[PDB]
Design a protein around this ligand. Structure first.
Ligand code: 1UJ
Length: 833
């Protein structure tokens, strides 16, 4: 229909990709997936509470932190309620449901709901107020809980549109006819590898022929694998060699319909590990890319129990030898009693053997131990990586994810969305899981949209698959969100244009012009006049709605990339703050890497949360919105650590100790408040000391480090260092705020938090190892070597004794004392040659 044809154009503009495009496919896999996803989409729309979906209560069932329980002069805590300048503070119990406070209103002074002042965050549902995320945020910040007596938002605004083995198999060895290669404009050979979970089952090469625009072979490449032995999820990896790899392409030997791939194929190749090297998608640039023409016509002993128990224990990056694999496979029923052995056991399977594969499925039936076990995110995710191409293995991991509460989904989301790059087929248990969790909760859904949209907008390798998952979501989120994302995209597209034009205007030559700041205000006034939405939603903080720009407050930052500095008025008039919303728009670096580091930082804070530690990290908002471009959060009242040095000193290099504490006393209204800033610095520094070290992003210029007037420290621009000696940034100016020029009471405390922190991350070695190895593979293609991945092993000191490693970190701190300003001076010198 005419109104159905227009709905798809609204989807296309939102997605950033035309999903109804068949000009780059050799099968109907994406269409089979659009169609396949219709049922889990309609099933989650129909299953969700309309009243609770509309209000998206953000809650946790995690035990209330020990540090935060102490914040209350226990048992009865007070919160402020508003309703037309009628504001009364009410003492409420932490175990009180919102309704208990709602019916306490009739007694104090239903048809109305408790909403937070300034943001779209309702305190609703049958949950104790201690379990609401906003309340916990306010407690820790030393901030007053302010709510307004709003009315419940209409679930009718969330209105949804109505509309929607293998048998070619025989004993014969598998063969593929390589006809030749063609590019529009040494010697060249083609490599044919049968891959399953990165493990090469069989490898065959061609006779090298002279390098020409049309190379022909007409050769049949018979493999050692029988047609019957081919496992579903296996890839035919075609690679072109000089000995250097030039081009590569993949083709899924078994269909999404379980059919062996028979026929003539002209595959457009990708030009030169990386997750992009795994893609089933062909190159869209059919005009410039090389193509490949192909044809397809077809009781246990103690000494040994000690050995596999030692294997079970070794980290996710320790390789298994044939000895280990054979042992694991033979004593597989024992290995099944230990859930932390499943990644090792499933990597001991001979996937190129139907017999072994069937036995693995027989072994999978007796999942009793696996299912009854407590969900290990580090173990679950380990089975979703590149080493696992089996659908049934991947599903048992996706099964454990079904038990994550919306709080923990939102937490591992980016990495679960990235884990989709490891799936053999477009339709998968994981893709579906992500769809259900998103369609169910607006916060999971809002983030899902941008997370998918970032990859769609800058990867020709996975945009097709990701675009399909997005259309499926967009069709079930509702008209409210469908309108809400529309105004978010309109604002981003306009601003991104402004960002690139102003980057072009500025020379790149160190300093910024008066006419550049004038042209910005002039271009912002043209956007503000008309076309730009009256109000929109902040993509990194969906709670906050941004109204109209503060054109006078907007400027162009004095950096080599020339980013935008934008201030926005809050759309809410209940904003009990004057404060504008500050967003930085920047073209230059891949903010997909900042996004990743920022997410692990959020994980480390949660790891510390369980050990009752708050290390005051500041993982600010950041969304990659397109090719080498995106938006960033402005952390209010913060300044560059180098800019504080550049103030007193005025120029590069001298660097005085006291300067830091000088600015701290300068920017603290009371010495009684300065004592709290000293306290906030001592562990906000400790947090970033540990974190950056573990992730190997500790060697950074003091320009890339910031501090608030309240003394909270934070590292910035992570993609800058990732697009390329000391352990971390601990400098004499920081050591001066502690009282060390030697030991002091604060520096003693710094090390104590550092040791308690480095050891707390170590109790989660395997989680951090998979998150890191996955992050490098799916996000940063520069650092995708065996050696780059293995950094987290040495950093976390795997296998080392708890006391022996506690010394390794205290020794690392001493390398900072050894080298006071040695490389901070070298960095300052380097960034000016
Ligand atoms: C590339 O810059 C960043 O990543 C970044 C992150 C946070 C941040 N917060 C800032 N705050 C202020 C007040 O300058 S500037 C800034 C910059």
């Amino acid at each position: 229909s005419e109104e159905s044809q227009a709905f798809q154009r609204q989807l296309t503009a939102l997605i950033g990709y035309d999903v109804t495009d068949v000009s780059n496919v050799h099968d109907d896999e994406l269409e089979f997936t659009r169609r396949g996803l219709v049922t889990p989409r309609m099933a989650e729309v129909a299953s969700r509470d309309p009243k609770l979906y509309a209000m998206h209560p953000w809650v946790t069932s995690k035990p209330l932190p020990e540090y935060l329980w102490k914040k209350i002069a226990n048992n009865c805590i007070f919160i402020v309620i508003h309703r037309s300048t009628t504001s009364q503070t009410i003492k409420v119990s932490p175990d009180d449901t919102p309704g208990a406070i709602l019916q306490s209103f009739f007694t104090k002074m239903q048809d109305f709901v408790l909403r937070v002042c300034g943001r779209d965050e309702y305190l609703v549902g049958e949950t104790p107020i201690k379990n609401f995320q906003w309340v916990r945020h306010c407690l820790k910040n030393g901030e007053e809980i302010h709510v307004v007596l709003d009315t419940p938002p209409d679930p009718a605004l969330d209105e949804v549109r109505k509309e929607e083995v293998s048998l070619w198999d025989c004993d014969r060895k598998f063969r593929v006819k390589i006809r030749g290669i063609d590019i529009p404009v040494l010697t060249v050979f083609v490599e044919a590898n049968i891959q399953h979970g990165q493990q090469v089952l069989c490898q065959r090469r061609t006779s090298p022929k002279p390098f020409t625009e049309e190379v022909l072979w007409n050769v049949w490449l018979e493999f050692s694998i029988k047609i019957k032995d081919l496992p579903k999820g296996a890839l035919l990896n075609l690679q072109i060699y000089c000995v250097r790899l030039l081009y590569y392409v993949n083709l899924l030997l078994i269909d999404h319909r379980f059919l062996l791939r028979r026929g003539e194929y002209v595959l457009h190749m990708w030009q030169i590990f990386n997750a992009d090297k795994l893609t089933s998608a062909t190159n869209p640039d059919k005009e410039n890319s090389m193509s490949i023409s192909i044809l397809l016509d077809n009781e246990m002993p103690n000494q040994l129990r000690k050995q596999l128990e030692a294997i079970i224990a070794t980290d996710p990056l320790n390789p298994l030898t044939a000895e280990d694999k054979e042992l694991l496979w033979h004593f597989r029923y024992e290995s099944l009693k230990h859930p932390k052995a499943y990644p090792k056991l499933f990597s001991s399977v001979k996937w190129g053997q139907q017999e072994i594969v069937a036995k693995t499925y027989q072994l999978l039936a007796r999942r009793e131990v696996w299912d009854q076990s407590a969900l290990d995110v580090g173990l679950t995710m380990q089975l979703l990586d590149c080493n696992f191409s089996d659908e049934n293995v991947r599903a048992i991991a996706v099964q454990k994810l079904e038990s994550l509460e919306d709080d923990d989904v939102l937490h591992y989301l980016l990495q679960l969305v990235q884990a989709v790059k490891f799936e053999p087929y477009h339709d998968s248990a994981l893709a579906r899981f992500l769809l259900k969790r998103g369609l169910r909760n607006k916060r999971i859904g809002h983030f899902l949209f941008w997370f998918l949209r970032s990859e769609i907008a800058q990867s020709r390798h996975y945009q097709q698959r990701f675009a399909v998952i997005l259309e499926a979501y967009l069709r079930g989120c509702g008209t409210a969100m469908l309108h809400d994302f529309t105004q978010q995209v309109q604002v981003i597209e306009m601003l991104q244009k402004v960002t690139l034009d102003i980057k072009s205007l500025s020379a790149e030559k160190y300093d910024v012009s008066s006419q550049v700041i004038s042209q910005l205000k002039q271009k912002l006034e043209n956007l503000q006049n008309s076309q730009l939405p009256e109000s929109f939603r902040v993509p990194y903080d969906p709670g906050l709605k941004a109204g109209a720009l503060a054109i006078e407050k907007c400027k162009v930052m004095a950096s080599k990339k020339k980013p935008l500095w934008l201030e926005f008025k809050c759309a809410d008039p209940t904003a009990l703050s004057n404060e504008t919303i500050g967003i930085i728009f920047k073209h230059g670096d891949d903010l997909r890497q900042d996004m990743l580091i920022l997410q692990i930082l959020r994980i480390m804070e949660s790891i510390w949360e369980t050990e009752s530690l708050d290390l005051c990290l500041l993982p600010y908002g950041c969304i990659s919105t397109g090719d080498k471009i995106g938006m960033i959060e402005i952390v209010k009242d913060a300044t560059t650590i180098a800019k504080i040095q550049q103030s007193t000193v005025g120029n590069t290099g001298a660097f005085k100790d006291e300067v830091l504490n000088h600015w701290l006393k300068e920017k603290s209204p009371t010495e009684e408040k300065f004592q709290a800033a000293v306290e906030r610095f001592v562990y906000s520094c400790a947090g970033y000391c540990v974190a950056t070290f573990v992730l190997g992003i500790g060697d950074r210029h003091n320009d890339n480090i910031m501090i608030t007037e309240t003394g909270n420290l934070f590292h910035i621009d992570f993609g800058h260092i990732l697009g390329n000696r000391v352990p971390f940034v601990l400098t004499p100016d920081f050591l001066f705020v502690m009282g060390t020029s030697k030991t002091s009471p604060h520096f003693q405390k710094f090390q104590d938090i550092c040791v308690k922190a480095y050891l707390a991350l170590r109790h989660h070695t395997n989680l951090l190892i998979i998150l890191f190895s996955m992050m490098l593979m799916t996000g940063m293609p520069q650092l995708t070597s065996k050696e780059d991945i293995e950094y987290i092993r040495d950093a976390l000191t795997v296998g080392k004794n708890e006391e022996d490693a506690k010394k390794y970190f205290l020794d690392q701190i001493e390398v900072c004392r050894d080298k006071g300003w040695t490389v901070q001076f070298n960095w300052f010198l380097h960034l000016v040659l």
